[PDB]
């Protein structure tokens, strides 16, 4: 004899038309004829755009930074479409189509001459930005199963997260920061310029609080 | 048998020299002194 626990009921969720992922073009309709500098500040640091859920209840959280090109979009689209139920699941893109050009000079030539020709296009992604957001009338356990496969194949490390799980790891990144028994923290030393540490630190380290180093985000650093 | 490429303290690949327990205490002793430094300048 056991306990008959209640089952979640999903009756207020409406499935929009065309629940499968939208196709994304390899190259934007209007090509960029002007080659611009390869900004690397678009990867460094925390994300400010698309950090919260809009419609769905499950998403892929980007722990690190990296570039997504047309190859990764095909991998994400094909895997989700053939693994979910169109009647009960709907997915939504949370990143734009590839727009930043990447330049590759010809094979085997001396340095100089100028920027080469445009090779392909990429989509910059920061840390903490949702990539693919999915919702529906099903529980998170089955959605998590085929989302970790997609998250594992992304360049940056990523996890499959839901509304409850995301809040729990954000409500624990504050409790672990409030009860820290170490008097000295990166925020205190860097801002106050103790030990003349500003000669070693970067001006962006004032905002990153030591949790971000290049494109790498370590969540365990307080 | 195992070599550090190029010079062992400059470049992309360096020596894996770790921080020691003695070095941590030296930082803390300087931090405690400077913590008192910014209190006497407060008022």
């Amino acid at each position: 004899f056991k306990t008959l626990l209640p089952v979640p009921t999903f009756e207020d969720v409406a499935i929009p038309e065309k629940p499968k992922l939208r196709f994304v073009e390899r190259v934007p309709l209007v090509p960029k004829v002007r080659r611009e500098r390869k900004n690397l500040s678009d990867i460094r640091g925390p994300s400010t755009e698309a950090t919260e859920f809009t419609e769905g209840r499950f998403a892929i959280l980007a722990l690190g930074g990296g570039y997504l090109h047309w190859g990764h979009f095909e991998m994400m689209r094909l895997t989700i479409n053939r693994s979910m139920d169109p009647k009960n699941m709907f997915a939504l893109w949370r990143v734009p189509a590839p727009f930043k050009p990447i330049t590759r000079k010809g094979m085997g030539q001396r340095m100089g001459g100028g920027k080469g020709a445009i090779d392909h296009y990429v989509t910059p992604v920061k840390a903490g930005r949702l990539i693919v957001e999915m919702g529906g009338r099903c529980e998170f356990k089955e959605v998590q199963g085929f989302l970790d496969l997609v998250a594992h194949k992304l360049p940056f490390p990523a996890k499959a997260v839901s509304r409850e799980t995301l809040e729990k790891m954000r409500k624990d990144q504050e409790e672990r920061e409030r009860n820290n028994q170490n008097p000295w923290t990166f925020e205190r030393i860097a801002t106050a310029n103790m030990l003349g540490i500003r000669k070693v630190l970067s001006p962006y380290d004032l905002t990153h609080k030591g949790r971000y180093w290049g494109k790498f985000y370590t969540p365990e650093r307080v | 048998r195992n070599r550090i490429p190029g010079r062992q303290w400059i470049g992309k690949h360096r020596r894996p020299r770790p921080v020691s327990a003695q070095a941590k205490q030296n930082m803390i002793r300087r931090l405690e002194t400077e913590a008192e430094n910014q209190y006497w300048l407060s008022r």
Binding site: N180, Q181, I189, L201, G214, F216 | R17, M27, I28
Partner: peptide
């Protein structure tokens, strides 16, 4: 010298390593 953002977990300056080791998180005991 390398760029600010690299692919190989850029090695920190030794002074910065001591800073990253003295500002660790110690859970309450």
């Amino acid at each position: 010298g390398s760029k600010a953002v690299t692919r190989h977990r850029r090695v920190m300056h030794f002074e910065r390593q001591k800073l990253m080791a003295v500002t660790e998180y110690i859970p309450p005991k």
